[PDB]
Amino acid sequence: ASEGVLLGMGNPLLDISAVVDDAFLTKYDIKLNNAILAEEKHLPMYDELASKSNVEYIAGGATQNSIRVAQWMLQTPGATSYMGCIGKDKFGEEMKKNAQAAGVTAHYYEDETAPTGTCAVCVVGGERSLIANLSAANCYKSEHLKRPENWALVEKAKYIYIAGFFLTVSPDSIQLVAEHAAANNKVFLMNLSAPFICEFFRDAQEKVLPYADYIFGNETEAKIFAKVRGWETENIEEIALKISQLPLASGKQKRIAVITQGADPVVVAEDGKVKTFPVILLPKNGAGDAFVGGFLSQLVLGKGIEDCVRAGCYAANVIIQRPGCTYPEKPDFN
Amino acid sequence: AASEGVLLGMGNPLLDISAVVDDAFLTKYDIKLNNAILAEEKHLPMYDELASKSNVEYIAGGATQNSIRVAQWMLQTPGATSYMGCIGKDKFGEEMKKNAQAAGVTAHYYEDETAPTGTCAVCVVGGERSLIANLSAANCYKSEHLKRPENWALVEKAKYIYIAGFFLTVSPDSIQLVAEHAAANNKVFLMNLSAPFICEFFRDAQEKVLPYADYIFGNETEAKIFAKVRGWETENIEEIALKISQLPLASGKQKRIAVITQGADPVVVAEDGKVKTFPVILLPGAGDAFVGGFLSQLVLGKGIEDCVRAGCYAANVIIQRPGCTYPEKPDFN
């Protein structure tokens, strides 16, 4: 994998992961197996987690998690890049530290007033409770992207992955890199993630879809996508095919749609046909992002779709057995 | 009559800069009609050109503020309405203050120290419009402004408090605070399904406020997204409206009314486990105006049919004008 061969752009959050007890959950009125927005009552909780010794800080956010998992899976130094917005605070410096530890070349845009986005990941057994404060992650501006030191990361990249959620934060950055990729034989990849469905988002998504070589999604996202645009089918295999056959921009040959269904098989539409892949488990939160990261690693290495899906399932199965989107030193995938 | 500050709205205010444009202007800035675009910064040459037009207008906009202004126009009683939201410390913030005062709305804006005021270029040709929005300060509202005694007095004064669902992306603490206050003090709290949430973070915030909503407004597309997101297999808008009205209720709330519009098709209203449907009556961004007309009659203690008819009247007036504007006085009975 060449230097900066894969780039991601998104909404970075510093994940503050810690194994907690009943007293902590009751104190901040947080229930397990649910992701809530941080309120004024939850803001001092980030200080309490920071004050603990066994705390793990991770350069998170869905896209950044995928880029880190791709980097871990590739094991080649300098193969990945990432751009997103952070604040000028200690949590921003921790995000810079962890991105460097994960081997990702991160060029963050520093907002002058917004604190860095954070996410408390409270762990008990195999259960999590996410409390997110997006804050600076929503302030990315295309002026950062257009600077020569940051545009060099787009120029270096052969694969550029940006989540659909970023269409609400910086649609000018997505359209700029998507149009650049079509004009310069690069692969543009996106997902069906969205905070909400509004006219502004609908129109921005419609403008980028022709430029997407790959579209990733989960069954719920695919079914919302199909219903929003009037497709009457609820079959995920047919929805994946219809996504792959959306209109194509000039300079884009084909589109591949990859739809995950949790325990049920991964659905892949390509060349007017749908192939389905059963999930293979390892002996005995962040799983979707890890799946995309494993898929991207093999895509970068020019491998086939079955290797891409198997690597995605491997990475997803590793990450689910660890607190947060974390992993061991080296992978063991073939 | 309507008492002082009887109706309050909280939201994301934008100064709408409206003007009739021509083909040359649309081509110049590569703008498509019947399209909503989010701009990261103000396209300064376009804003100056729009300002230099003959029929230009500066309106204190944003979906909720539009509803509050339409309700104030419909009521015609000075001081009956209030509004809170975030603006910047600039000329557009002062124009926003000027237009809110001209519309007769008591606006207590939170002034962000660095973010410019949110703006929206409204480019109108015929019966079509194109919107280019730079939200900027509108997304920086903080509950510290709400909790100040001079601003909390507007909550205390109000009998009806209306907030869009989208405002949960800006200040969920303000929404939850006023929604919980309304349930404890016999006030009516109203919301809409605008920007239906798909993300788990936003879904959990909405789930926490829905038990406090006495009224939920929505359109057919929003209602169908809401139903699909939470696993309801029905696609019938009449049944979806009934299921919304029957969502769990918080302590101190006896019933919920769900109002779903369907464009040309009738207004659907669910109440007391039954669904009543109202054909649209015609005159010889209409949704905000519909809500404003409905709110005006609700403030006057009128029945649901009057509320729906006033909503249709206001919506039919606003569609025949550039942006969410109206004549001096209403003619509704």
Numbering used by the authors:
A (entry chain A): 3 to 286, 293 to 342
B (entry chain B): 2 to 285, 294 to 342
Give the authors' words.
Adenosine undergoes ATP-dependent phosphorylation catalyzed by adenosine kinase (ADK). In plants, ADK also phosphorylates cytokinin ribosides, transport forms of the hormone.
Of the two selected representatives, ZmADK2 and PpADK1, we only obtained crystals of the apo form of ZmADK2. Crystallization conditions of ZmADK2 favored the dimeric form to be present in the asymmetric unit, which contains two ZmADK2 molecules, each in the open conformation, and resembles that of HsADK, with an average root mean square deviation (RMSD) of ~1.2 Å and 1.4 Å for all Cα atoms. Each monomer is composed of two domains: a large 10-stranded α/β Rossmann-like nucleotide-binding domain (residues 1–14, 64–117, and 137–340) comprising the ATP-binding site; and a small five-stranded α/β domain (residues 17–61 and 120–134). The small domain encompases β2, β3, β4, β8, and β9 sheets, plus α1 and α2 helices. The existence of the dimer was further confirmed by X-ray crystallography on ZmADK2, and the structure explains why this oligomeric state is not functional. So far, such a dimer arrangement has not been reported for any other ADK. Remarkably, the dimer interface prevents displacement of the small domains. We further showed that the ADK dimer can exist only when both subunits are in an open conformation, as observed in the ZmADK2 structure. When in a dimeric state, the enzyme cannot be catalytically active as the rotation of the small domain and closure of the substrate cavity for catalysis is blocked.
